[PDB]
Amino acid sequence: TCATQRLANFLVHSSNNFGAILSSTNVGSNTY
Amino acid sequence: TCATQRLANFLVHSSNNFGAILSSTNVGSNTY
Amino acid sequence: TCATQRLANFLVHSSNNFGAILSSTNVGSNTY
Amino acid sequence: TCATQRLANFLVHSSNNFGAILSSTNVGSNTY
Amino acid sequence: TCATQRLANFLVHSSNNFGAILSSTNVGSNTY
Amino acid sequence: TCATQRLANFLVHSSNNFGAILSSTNVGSNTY
Amino acid sequence: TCATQRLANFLVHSSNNFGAILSSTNVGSNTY
Amino acid sequence: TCATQRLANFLVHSSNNFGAILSSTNVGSNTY
Amino acid sequence: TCATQRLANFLVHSSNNFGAILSSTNVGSNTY
Amino acid sequence: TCATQRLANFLVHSSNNFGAILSSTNVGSNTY
């Protein structure tokens, strides 16, 4: 029995949920 | 019995849920 | 018995659910 | 018995459900 | 029985949740 | 013009895709 | 023009994709 | 123009992707 | 123009991705 | 123009990614 782990380039570029842009705001952007 | 793991380029570019753009806002953007 | 895992380019470009664009907003965008 | 996994380019470009565009909004966009 | 771990380039470039841009703000940006 | 949102019990009990059960495994389970 | 948001019980009990059960494993479980 | 936000019980009980159970392991569990 | 935010019980009980249980391990558990 | 923020009970009980349980370990637990 042996246990060798070789994980390369694990990535989660997560940008998931709610974004609140509300009032009187003409926005050139992209909010997380 | 052996256990070798070789995972390359695991990725979840998640941008999932609710986006709130509400009122009086002409927005050139893309909110997460 | 052996266990070798070689996973390459796992990806879920998830952008799934509800998007709330509400009132008085002429929006050139694409909200997540 | 052996277990070799070689998965390449797993992808789910999911953009599934409800999109809420409500009132007084002439929108050039595509909301998730 | 042996336990060798060789993990390379573990990464989570997480920028997940709520972003609050509220009022009278024409913003060229991208807030986390 | 008004914008009132009253959403109750939004749900997506998603368990969608590929399930990999491979070899020499009599499994009493249900894998996501 | 007004913007009132009253969202209650937003939920996504997501358990979506690939599950890897490979070899010589009689498993009473349910892996995400 | 007004911007009032009243969001209650925002939830994403996400447990989404790959689960790796590999070899010689009779497991009573449920791994994320 | 006004900007009032009243957000209650924002929650993401996220337990998303890869779980590595490898070899010679009969495990009563649930690993994140 | 006014900016009032009243956020109550902001929470992200995040326990997301990789969990490494490897070899010769019968574990009653739940590792983050």
Nearest to B14 by CA among C17, J11, G1, E20: C17
Distance of CA B25 to the CA centre of its chain: 24
Nearest to I32 by CA among B10, H14, E15, C7: H14
d(CA C22, CA J27): 51
Candidate from I3, I17, I24 with C-beta closest to A22 = I3
Using the CB atoms, write b or e for C1-32: b if 16+ within 10 Å: bbbbbebbebbbebbbbbbbbbbbbebebbbb
Residue type at position B4:
T
Note whether G24 contacts B1, CB cutoff 8 Å.
yes
Please give the helix or strand (H or E) that residue J28 lies within, else none.
strand J28-29
d(CA D19, CA E24): 26
Residue C25 neighbours by CB under 8 Å, 6+ apart: B21, B22, B23, B24, B25, B26, B27, D24, D25, D27
Name the DSSP letter for residue A24.
S
H16 CB neighbours in chain C (<8 A) are 12
d(CA E21, CA B23): 12
Q: Are F20 and G19 in contact (CB under 8 A)?
A: yes
Bridge partner residues of A20 (DSSP): B20, E20
Contact between chain A and chain D (3 or more Cβ pairs less than 8 Å apart): no
Pairing of strands H28-29, I28-29: parallel
Note whether I18 contacts A10, CB cutoff 8 Å.
yes
J22 CB neighbours in chain A (<8 A) are 3, 5
Instruction: Give the count of beta carbons closer than 10 Å to the beta carbon of residue E11.
Output: 12
Number of H helices, E strands in chain C: 0, 3
Beta-strand ranges (E) seen in chain I are 2-10, 20-23, 28-29
- Report the neighbours of A using a cutoff of 3 or more CB pairs below 8 angstroms: B, C, E, H, I, J
Q: Which of residues 1-32 of D touch C (CB under 8 A)?
A: 1-32
Q: Which residue do the tokens 């797993």 mark?
A: D10
Q: Which resolution in angstroms does this entry have?
A: 3.9
Q: Are F18 and G16 in contact (CB under 8 A)?
A: no
CA distance H5 to chain F (A): 10
Name the DSSP letter for residue H6.
E
d(CA J30, CA J32): 7
Computed on alpha carbons and rounded to an integer, the radius of gyration of chain I in Å comes to 20
Residue D12 neighbours by CB under 8 Å, 6+ apart: C11, C12, C13, C14, F16, F17, G16, G17
Q: Are H7 and J11 in contact (CB under 8 A)?
A: no
Q: Please work out, in degrees rounded to the nearest 5, the angle formed at the alpha carbon of residue H31 by the alpha carbons of F10 and A18.
A: 30
